[PDB]
Amino acid sequence: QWALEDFEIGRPLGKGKFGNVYLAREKQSKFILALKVLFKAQLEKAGVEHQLRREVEIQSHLRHPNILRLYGYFHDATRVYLILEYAPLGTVYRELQKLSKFDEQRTATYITELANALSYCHSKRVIHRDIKPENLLLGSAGELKIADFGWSVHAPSSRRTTLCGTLDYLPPEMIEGRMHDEKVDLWSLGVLCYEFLVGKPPFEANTYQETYKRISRVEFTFPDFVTEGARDLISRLLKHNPSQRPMLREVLEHPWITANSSK
Numbered sequence: 305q306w307a308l309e310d311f312e313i314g315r316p317l318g319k320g321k322f323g324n325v326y327l328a329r330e331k332q333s334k335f336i337l338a339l340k341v342l343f344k345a346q347l348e349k350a351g352v353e354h355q356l357r358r359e360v361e362i363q364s365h366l367r368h369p370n371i372l373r374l375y376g377y378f379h380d381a382t383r384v385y386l387i388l389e390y391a392p393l394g395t396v397y398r399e400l401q402k403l404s405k406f407d408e409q410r411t412a413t414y415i416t417e418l419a420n421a422l423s424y425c426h427s428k429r430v431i432h433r434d435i436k437p438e439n440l441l442l443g444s445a446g447e448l449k450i451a452d453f454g455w456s457v458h459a460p461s462s463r464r465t466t467l468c469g470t471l472d473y474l475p476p477e478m479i480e481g482r483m484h485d486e487k488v489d490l491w492s493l494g495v496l497c498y499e500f501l502v503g504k505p506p507f508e509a510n511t512y513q514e515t516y517k518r519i520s521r522v523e524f525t526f527p528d529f530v531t532e533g534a535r536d537l538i539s540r541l542l543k544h545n546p547s548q549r550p551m552l553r554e555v556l557e558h559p560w561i562t563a564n565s566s567k
């Protein structure tokens with residue numbers, strides 16, 4: 305179907321791990337999209353061929369406003385290309401760098417859009433397992449959109465034995481190896497809600513063994529400006545027990561969420 309020679313490459317949209325992401329227009333259509341370039345050599349050397357496989361499959365059959373679409377993909381002698389949907393406003397990561405902190409109104413709305421998309425994924429038994437400012441994109445109308453389903457999985461799962469990852473947004477179960485479920489995304493949605501209000505993750509540390517400790521111990525504190533409503537929602541998601549964590553409906557209904565969110 306598609307070939308590199310079908311597209312006009314634009315400017316570098318962002319930097320991934322197995323390759324950068326670029327802007328690009330379809331030659332006859334003039335359709336603007338993002339082309340995620342991945343190097344086969346690097347993918348092989350890391351043995352993540354199966355992860356790119358799931359990412360492509362899962363995301364491709366996904367259909368939700370708050371979820372970045374994956375039209376198709378194709379490839380060549382050296383790299384693999386993923387035809388994604390273009391996110392004009394960039395990432396929540398950059399927006400967080402710009403504003404340092406987000407207000408409750410902006411955070412509540414960013415949480416609803418995320419809880420909606422996550423619900424849609426969990427309804428199909430799909431865990432993202434990698435929800436963070438870098439993989440959260442903003443659409444034309446500033447709406448949120450979860451992307452990078454590289455760690456996404458159709459399941460109840462165990463690890464893949466490795467871990468490139470800023471533990472920050474990872475749940476206790478994963479960080480330690482156990483058999484996890486969809487409740488990991490609820491945990492991330494807590495770290496995220498805290499980072500949006502404070503400006504940094506709740507388990508941030510200077511080392512990977514210091515962060516490891518705080519996440520497993522669930523060691524975090526709230527700054528004074530963090531209202532009681534936010535403190536309650538965050539304290540419910542960040543449970544050490546996957547079972548105690550609330551359901552996406554208790555999140556979409558939570559008093560703080562319904563009193564500040566616009567969506």
Ligand SMILES: Nc1ncnc2c1ncn2[C@@H]1O[C@H](COP(=O)(O)OP(=O)(O)O)[C@@H](O)[C@H]1O
Nearest residue numbers: 317318319320321325338389390391438439452
């Ligand atoms: N469709 C897109 N539009 C704009 N930027 C993108 C897009 N896809 C990815 N990026 C940028 O690339 C970065 C990394 O690519 P991503 O695919 O999300 O993760 P990975 O590191 O697994 O490749 C993101 O943090 C983001 O800044």
Ligand SMILES: [Mg+2]
Nearest residue numbers: 320438439452
């Ligand atoms: Mg990424």
Ligand SMILES: [Mg+2]
Nearest residue numbers: 434452454455
């Ligand atoms: Mg990834």
